[PDB]
Amino acid sequence: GLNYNQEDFMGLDRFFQDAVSHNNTDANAASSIEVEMYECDCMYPTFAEIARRSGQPEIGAMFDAIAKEEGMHAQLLTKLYSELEVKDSAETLEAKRLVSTIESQIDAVASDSRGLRRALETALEVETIESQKTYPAFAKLAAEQGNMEVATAFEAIVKSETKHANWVKRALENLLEVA
Ligand SMILES: [Fe+3]
Ligand SMILES: [Fe+3]
Ligand SMILES: [Fe+3]
User: Fold this and answer.
1) Coiled coil located at which positions?
2) Distance from chain centroid for Cα 145
């Protein structure tokens, strides 16, 4: 039938952006670079600011540390595809617009305890999808195509995103435990 669910507070869930799947590993690298750099330079810095403005500077520092590692993921792929020209898709542009909306309301976002909770839950959502679904599938196709260096790179990114997921889960557990 019709099956309606409330959208998340402040639309914070729409910060998650999903790399697009293609037949060709060059194109999956391009899509991954695009999302990795978006997370490095837009999504995670915004989450870090939400955390700091919420009075949670340790969680802010974790998002800053994750942001740097997303940029490492992008730079590993860029090294392997030195000539690729990466442009932001409509969906990335729309995410960056949403980022700027949140930044303009950052005090209201942070003063409600949902701001940081939903930022950590969206970070967990992307780290989960990337580590368990997207990047394993990119690794598998690269290997099928005989591109061992790129398959090995995606395998390393899988392990790194898995670590991020674990950092985010521990942070969420600590945010939610008062004492
Ligand atoms: Fe990522
Ligand atoms: Fe990444
Ligand atoms: Fe990550």
Assistant:
1) none
2) 26
Ligand 1 centroid from CA 12, angstroms: 17
Annotated binding-site residue? 94: no
Q: What is the Cα–Cα distance from 94 to 175, expressed in whole angstroms?
A: 29
Distance in angstroms (rounded) separating the CA atoms of residues 76 and 125:
23
| Rg from Cα positions in the chain | 17
Domains present along the chain, CATH in parentheses: 1-179 (1.20.1260.10)
Q: How many CB atoms lie within 10 A of CB 157?
A: 26
- If you measure from the C-alpha of residue 108 to the centroid of ligand 3, how many angstroms do you get, rounded to a whole number? 26
User: What's the gap in Å between 164 CA and the centre of ligand 1?
Assistant: 9
Q: How far does residue 127's CA lie from ligand 3's centre (Å)?
A: 5
91 CB-near residues (< 8 Å, 6+ apart): 17
Helix H segments across 22-147? 25-38, 44-53, 57-80, 90-104, 106-111, 113-129, 135-144
Tokens representing 45 are 């810095």
Which ligand is located closest to the Cα atom of residue 74? 2
Binding site annotation covers 127? yes
Resolution in angstroms comes to 1.2
**How determined?**
X-ray
